[PDB]
Amino acid sequence: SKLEAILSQEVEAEIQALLQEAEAKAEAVKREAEEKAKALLQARERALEAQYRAALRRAESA
Amino acid sequence: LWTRAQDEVARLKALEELASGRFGFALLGYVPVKAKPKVEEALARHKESV
């Protein structure tokens, strides 16, 4: 029926709006996890650079 | 105010006697065939002519 299709379309549109909002939140969570991983990789890279600098300093000292 | 409250309370009591269709609604009633013209005019006066 016309009201049948309208009610099914309204339920599907509410589910689609909810799914789009949840997918936007999940993509924001993925972007935040990527930002935290980039910060951790930057910390590990600075640690490796400081370790190589200290190793070169110890080698030149010896 | 008493007439408006009687009208609103009658509408509230009439809302209890309905039958839903899971975000849908359907109902049955009895009206005269001689009063079918004004009832059809009111049905066309509805938001959808359902």
Swiss-Prot record, chain A:
Signal sequence region: none
Similarity field: Belongs to the V-ATPase E subunit family.
Cited function: Produces ATP from ADP in the presence of a proton gradient across the membrane.
Residues of the full protein shown: 2 to 63 of 188
Species whose genome carries this gene: Thermus thermophilus (strain ATCC 27634 / DSM 579 / HB8)
Coiled coil: none
Name of the protein in its database record: V-type ATP synthase subunit E
Record-annotated disulphide pairs: none
